[PDB]
Amino acid sequence: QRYALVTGANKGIGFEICRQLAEKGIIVILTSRNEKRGLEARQKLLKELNVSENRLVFHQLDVTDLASVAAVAVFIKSKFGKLDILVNNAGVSGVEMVGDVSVFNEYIEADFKALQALEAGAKEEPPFKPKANGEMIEKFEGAKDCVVTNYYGPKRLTQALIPLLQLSPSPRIVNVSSSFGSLLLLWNEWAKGVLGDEDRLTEERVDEVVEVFLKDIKEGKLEESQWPPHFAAERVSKAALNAYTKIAAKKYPSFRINAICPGYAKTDITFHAGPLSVAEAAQVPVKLALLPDGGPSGCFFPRDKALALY
Numbered sequence: 001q002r003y004a005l006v007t008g009a010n011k012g013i014g015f016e017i018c019r020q021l022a023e024k025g026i027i028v029i030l031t032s033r034n035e036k037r038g039l040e041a042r043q044k045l046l047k048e049l050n051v052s053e054n055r056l057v058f059h060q061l062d063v064t065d066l067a068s069v070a071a072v073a074v075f076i077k078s079k080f081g082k083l084d085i086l087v088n089n090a091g092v093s094g095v096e097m098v099g100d101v102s103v104f105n106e107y108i109e110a111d112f113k114a115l116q117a118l119e120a121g122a123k124e125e126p127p128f129k130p131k132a133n134g135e136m137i138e139k140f141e142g143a144k145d146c147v148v149t150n151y152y153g154p155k156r157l158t159q160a161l162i163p164l165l166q167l168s169p170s171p172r173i174v175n176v177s178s179s180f181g182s183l184l185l186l187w188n189e190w191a192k193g194v195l196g197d198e199d200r201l202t203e204e205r206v207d208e209v210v211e212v213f214l215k216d217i218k219e220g221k222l223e224e225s226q227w228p229p230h231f232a233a234e235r236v237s238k239a240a241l242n243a244y245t246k247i248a249a250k251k252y253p254s255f256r257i258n259a260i261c262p263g264y265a266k267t268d269i270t271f272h273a274g275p276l277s278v279a280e281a282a283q284v285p286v287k288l289a290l291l292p293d294g295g296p297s298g299c300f301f302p303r304d305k306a307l308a309l310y
């Protein structure tokens with residue numbers, strides 16, 4: 001029997017990851033930071049799956065709360081004795097909208113277009129201002145929450161669950177990153193060199209990058225910095241997550257540890273805009289959670305590359 005834990009699973013992609021793994025016969029620990037939302041999610045999904053009660057287990061988990069993280073490791077040890085699959089799905093954007101919320105989608109569309117141009121060799125990210133009457137507000141508190149959730153969360157939960165994952169015959173970690181973690185989007189030349197220098201990459205180096213970013217947004221104005229012009233904490237945190245994916249994969253070679261982008265999908269975080277359904281999005285992390293032994297590890301896969309892997 002295989003056991004999978006999914007973070008941020010009361011809604012969105014994480015809820016659908018739980019569905020798709022459970023349909024494979026994997027026993028899923030659906031976790032969520034709010035107990036009521038998670039219990040209700042478990043009830044709804046058990047109904048929709050139409051399977052017996054033991055196929056889906058709820059446990060509270062806030063990935064920014066070190067006691068919460070420790071407690072779920074104790075629970076898994078006592079109830080199951082091992083873990084086979086960890087999906088680090090929980091995430092936040094670091095952005096507060098003012099005015100017309102579809103401005104969030106305007107910036108997403110602009111940044112995918114910019115990434116395509118940079119991936120094709122363009123040297124510069126085009127400047128962007130939105131059309132509709134709204135703006136993305138990026139403050140220190142949001143950025144800190146974004147970094148602590150998106151980067152420290154997966155790192156700390158990975159570290160807490162290593163002893164249980166080591167008892168699996170095929171240990172799997174999937175980190176739900178985003179395409180906006182590309183170093184092409186990160187702007188900061190020091191940080192791009194650090195996160196890109198794989199032979200010198202350590203957890204200490206990545207922690208240092210994100211802490212310099214947070215100090216910069218706290219203490220001054222990012223427009224004067226060499227950090228990104230917008231989605232700054234999203235970019236930094238997801239780049240840091242991708243780097244930690246590589247660090248962990250090298251440290252735990254018997255595991256397969258990968259980062260993915262699910263594609264642009266309709267969830268609360270995107271105001272339910274984007275071309276993909278939430279079921280379509282979850283296909284990507286599920287694909288890497290079921291990767292056969294010997295497959296790639298330590299990598300970042302965007303959607304189409306992920307789905308083509310086998």
Ligand SMILES: NC(=O)c1ccc[n+]([C@@H]2O[C@H](COP(=O)([O-])OP(=O)(O)OC[C@H]3O[C@@H](n4cnc5c(N)ncnc54)[C@H](OP(=O)(O)O)[C@@H]3O)[C@@H](O)[C@H]2O)c1
Pocket residue numbers: 007008009010011012013014032033034037061062063064089090091092149176177178179261262263264265266267268269270274
């Ligand atoms: N949708 C897209 O287009 C897209 C594209 C690329 C990457 N992603 C990534 O996909 C992941 C899932 O987001 P989504 O699109 O499914 O959005 P979503 O519907 O907003 O779901 C986010 C989930 O994360 C949970 N969460 C947030 N902070 C948490 C914390 N401290 N501890 C535990 N759970 C926490 C949320 O819980 P609450 O209900 O309590 O807030 C919710 O369950 C994120 O990591 C995001 O960066 C999404």
